[PDB]
Amino acid sequence: KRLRIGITLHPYYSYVSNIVGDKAEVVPLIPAGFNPGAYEPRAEDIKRIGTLDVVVLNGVGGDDFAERMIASSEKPGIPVIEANAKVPLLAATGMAARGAGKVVNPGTFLSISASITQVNTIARELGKLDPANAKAYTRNARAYAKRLRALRADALARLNKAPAADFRVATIGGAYDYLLREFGLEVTAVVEPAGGIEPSPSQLKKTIDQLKALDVKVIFSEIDFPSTYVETIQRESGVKLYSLSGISYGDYSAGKYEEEMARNLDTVVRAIQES
Ligand code: NA
Ligand code: NA
Ligand code: NA
Ligand code: NA
Ligand code: NA
Ligand code: NA
Numbered sequence: 001k002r003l004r005i006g007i008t009l010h011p012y013y014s015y016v017s018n019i020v021g022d023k024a025e026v027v028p029l030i031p032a033g034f035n036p037g038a039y040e041p042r043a044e045d046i047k048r049i050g051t052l053d054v055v056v057l058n059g060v061g062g063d064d065f066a067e068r069m070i071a072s073s074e075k076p077g078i079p080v081i082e083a084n085a086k087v088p089l090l091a092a093t094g095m096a097a098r099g100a101g102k103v104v105n106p107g108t109f110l111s112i113s114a115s116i117t118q119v120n121t122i123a124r125e126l127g128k129l130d131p132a133n134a135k136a137y138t139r140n141a142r143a144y145a146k147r148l149r150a151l152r153a154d155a156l157a158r159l160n161k162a163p164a165a166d167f168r169v170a171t172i173g174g175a176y177d178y179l180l181r182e183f184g185l186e187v188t189a190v191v192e193p194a195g196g197i198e199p200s201p202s203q204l205k206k207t208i209d210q211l212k213a214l215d216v217k218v219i220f221s222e223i224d225f226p227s228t229y230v231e232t233i234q235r236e237s238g239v240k241l242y243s244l245s246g247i248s249y250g251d252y253s254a255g256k257y258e259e260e261m262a263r264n265l266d267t268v269v270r271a272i273q274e275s
Contacts, residue, residue: 003130006055008036008063010247011109012083012122014257016056018144019123023133027052029066032251036065049073054129056081056122060089062106081125083118084108090177094192097174109247111178112152112261116145147258155183155265159272166275170214172207173222176244176264180220183268188216193223204229211237218271220244242271 003024007013016026030036030045046069049055055070057063059082070076092102108114123141127134159167168186171177173193180187191210195203211219217239224243225233233241244264247257 003054003126003133004052005126006049006052006066006078007252008056008066009058009109010249010252011115011257012056012058012118013252014254015083015115015119015122015144016126017254019119019126019137019140020133021136021140023136024126024130026252028252029055029069035248036063039065041065041069045069046072047074049078050075052078054079054081054126056083058083058106058108060084060087060104060106060108061092061102062109079129081122083121084114085121087114087117090174090181093174093190096192105174105177107175107246108178109257110176110244110261110264111182112148113182114178115257116148119144119148148261151258151262151265152182155269158269159183162272166218166272168216169218169220169271170211170216170239171220171222172241175222175246176220179244179264179268183265185268185272189214191219197223197225197229199229204232208233208236211239214239218242218275220268220271240271240274242267244268 004027005016005024006027006029007016008029013026013028020026030039030041049070050073055066055078057066057080070078087108090105092105119141123137126137167184168188170188170191172191174190191207194206199207211233219239219241221241221243230241233239244267245260247260
């Protein structure tokens with residue numbers, strides 16, 4: 001009776017939940033506790049696609065697993081929502097991105113303005129599939145966007161207090177590229193991620209060497225290093241390492257996206273205010 005909407009990544013559960021409310025069912029494609037980098041979808045997950053009416057996709061490199069799961073299902077021609085259709089995309093850069101054939105950065109969801117565009121795109125397409133609830137989906141998308149804009153405005157107001165020189169930062173990877181660009185942060189250099197969260201002494205040395213060579217004091221890292229590594233990096237290079245949430249862990253909830261974006265924007269503001 002109610003429309004059954006498939007979702008891939010955690011932010012899309014928040015988007016769809018806030019758009020539909022109780023009027024439709026929001027169905028995660030892959031279970032909570034599992035990251036699709038790497039996790040192999042079960043027959044149970046593929047069978048579930050046969051119970052859905054539409055699948056919302058990031059569709060720009062964030063959820064390639066979803067298109068493969070759909071092709072193997074009982075509904076390969078199921079309606080799909082390309083959430084990023086109207087979102088201007090950022091290039092994926094570095095040795096790793098080039099070596100993987102990655103053209104675009106898919107983390108559009110870490111931008112508030114991009115999330116608003118995706119929410120409006122989902123709400124429009126959902127109403128085409130379920131005309132009876134089209135008015136409600138639009139009204140909910142408007143209320144959701146309003147809350148999201150207030151979050152963007154609040155962070156932008158707190159950064160307005162800070163001088164333009166403080167906005168010169170650097171990164172380890174490009175995971176937060178859409179967020180940093182949106183909040184007017186100038187990325188001086190991008191240090192290529194080497195060796196994971198627990199790098200070898202040789203891999204850590206190379207990172208510290210690349211960091212001390214920089215003229216910035218704040219670094220946003222894609223790699224969430226344990227405190228001992230952070231402590232060593234900071235003491236040996238004089239930079240301050242900050243990590244943000246990629247909104248990809250634990251339970252699916254309607255509030256997850258906004259709760260974690262609030263915190264990410266708190267870290268960015270704290271980083272610049274402390275510099
Ligand atoms: Na990716
Ligand atoms: Na489509
Ligand atoms: Na990345
Ligand atoms: Na060494
Ligand atoms: Na720190
Ligand atoms: Na759930």
